[PDB]
Symmetry: C2
Subunit: 186 residues, 2 copies
């Protein structure tokens, strides 16, 4: 009954894609993995090939979504940053006061599309300078940062924390705790 | 220059599949994701669809491998446990004194194929009783267990530790440390 849209572009970090999709489905969220380029399989940064559930064009017609999720991976985030379709989805989600979650270089697509300026954010350490160009955000080193409806995180190793923060935001702390225990997190 | 074979069956835990593949490729290992059933895309436990690099039939002809990796997921591990092809690959890897790595319900395929008896092993907590049927192994609660050439781990949340243990076994501690830092692990 909550719904998530995960936007999958060539060059996405596959761990940052699969960990949130899997954890959100464990939480009972209806997740649509949507291909930026169309319905065809997507070659991720480390050459894992993932078949999306739908094209982004089709998935948009089925919104709105409770969260829009942007994986990282530098080339994936670049492709999200260059997409007019992504711009329109994020602007509409911002406008309706829905959650936007981005991990690793993913938040640099928020910069590109002028989303969430004035928010505290984090990114992978190597993406800090790009994200901070112009001083439009306030930078954090927290592993997960949530400033209202903009949720960001740092890297593959923060992907479980990121996904469980999404789950808590949508489904509450009790569901997040229930989902977390079987994962054998430290 | 080291080589890994990852055997991907329907119902595999996608996080336990993708995290080791990605981390091992970061370490410079040549990884073949081989489909148990053939060359076609594989529907994982949480409905992520992954396109393998090759069928297992083809990938075997290209061995030997420095490690054979068995992801978890209960139905994935069941399919690995029922496969005569997997039996032959694991027996040959055992015989040549090559590493076998299995995570979560994955080690129950070792039981099925009578691999590594007498070793200390771990599994997901919910797979302990199945793994221990007959007392053929000695159970551990360590997050990663390595008893010589049998390497096991417990769940999605131990997948990074599992993958970095594989990297250390193949490529050494210095490479594992170099791969680990950009991941933003805690």
């Amino acid at each position: 009954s909550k719904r998530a849209l995960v936007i999958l572009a060539k060059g996405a970090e596959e761990m940052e894609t699969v960990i949130p999709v899997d954890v959100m489905r464990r939480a009972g969220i209806k997740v649509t993995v949507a291909g930026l380029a169309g319905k065809d399989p997507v070659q991720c940064s480390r050459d894992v090939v993932i078949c999306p559930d739908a094209s982004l064009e089709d998935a948009k017609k089925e919104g709105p979504y409770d969260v829009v999720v942007l994986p990282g991976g530098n080339l994936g985030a670049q492709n999200l940053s260059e997409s007019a379709a992504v711009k329109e989805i994020l602007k509409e989600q911002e406008n309706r006061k829905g959650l936007i979650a981005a991990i690793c270089a993913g938040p640099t697509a928020l910069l590109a599309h002028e989303i969430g300026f004035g928010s505290k954010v984090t990114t992978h350490p190597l993406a800090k300078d790009k994200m901070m160009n112009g001083g439009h955000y306030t930078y954090s080193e927290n592993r997960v940062e949530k400033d209202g409806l903009i949720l960001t995180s740092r890297g593959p190793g923060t992907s479980f924390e990121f996904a469980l923060a999404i789950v808590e935001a949508l489904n509450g702390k009790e569901v997040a705790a229930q989902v977390k225990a079987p994962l054998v997190l430290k």
